[PDB]
């Protein structure tokens, strides 16, 4: 995260870390949406342009973490990926359209004051909170500009108008995505950097005080606007996979 700050312990109990086994290091971010389901970007696991193809065994998930590296007894829990589900229509060759993936755990994880699932949107919530101007929140252990944050970072940023999203790049932004971030003339900066991909983009609903995941970090603006996966746009798919298992 760029221009963010150290998050408060348990400020995002749904944050999930995708830790690689060798080299042992952080791969991406993710969120906990249930006791057995983890949500992340598709390119965090499979991205041919970079010869990237991670199998379930190539890693695991560290849940309820705060520090970026230090192991955290009686705080973080580690799970084993049972199955990975990349979106069928996920295309990387053009613009990461439908850059989303589901990861099921071999064993359900218990919740705590540090580990707690986030709610997925719905047309009402989405249609009402997904509006340019409104600020969402992003978190992660991605780089900063040393460039390695000690603990999870946090930053809030505005949704940018689809029209503006378009002009800001030659990439054909689809409806399954939306861009967020500040305009150069805003002064204040802040965005998702490399390593924060697969991370949750959330909003606190005023109509019920609960936090909702509107997007997934697909293409951080820098370290221009960041591109995120439209979670509701793909909710249908999510369930289809859930009901399936």
């Amino acid at each position: 995260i760029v221009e963010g700050s150290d998050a408060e312990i348990g400020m995002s109990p749904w944050q999930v870390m995708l830790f690689r086994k060798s080299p042992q290091e952080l791969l991406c971010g993710a969120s906990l949406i249930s006791d057995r389901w983890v949500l992340t970007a598709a390119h965090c696991l499979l991205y041919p342009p970079w010869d990237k193809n991670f199998t379930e065994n190539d890693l695991l998930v560290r849940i309820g973490k705060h520090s970026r590296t230090r192991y955290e007894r009686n705080i973080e829990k580690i799970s084993m990926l049972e199955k990975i589900y990349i979106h069928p229509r996920y295309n990387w060759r053009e613009n990461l359209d439908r850059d989303i993936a589901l990861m099921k755990l071999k064993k359900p994880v218990a919740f705590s004051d540090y580990i707690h699932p986030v709610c997925l949107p719905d047309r009402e919530t989405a249609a009402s909170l997904l509006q340019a101007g409104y600020k969402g929140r992003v978190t992660g252990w991605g780089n900063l500009k040393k460039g390695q944050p000690s603990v999870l970072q946090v930053v809030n940023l505005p949704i940018v108008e689809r029209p503006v999203c378009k002009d800001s790049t030659r990439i054909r932004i689809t409806d399954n995505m939306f861009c967020a971030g500040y305009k150069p003339d805003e002064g204040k900066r802040g965005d998702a950097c490399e390593g924060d991909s697969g991370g949750p983009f959330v909003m606190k609903s005023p109509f019920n005080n609960r936090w909702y995941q509107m997007g997934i970090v697909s293409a951080g603006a820098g370290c221009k606007y960041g591109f995120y996966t439209h979670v509701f746009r793909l909710k249908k798919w999510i369930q289809k996979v859930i009901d399936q298992f």
Binding site: S5, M11, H116, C119, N156, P158, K204, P206
Partner: peptide, 30 residues
Amino acid sequence: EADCGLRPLFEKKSLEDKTERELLESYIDG
């Protein structure tokens, strides 16, 4: 899942995280 979105150390104790208000203000405008 039925208690999702509410933070054990924040909402559940009537506490506001360091900068969530900013988000609230966004809905308003400033």
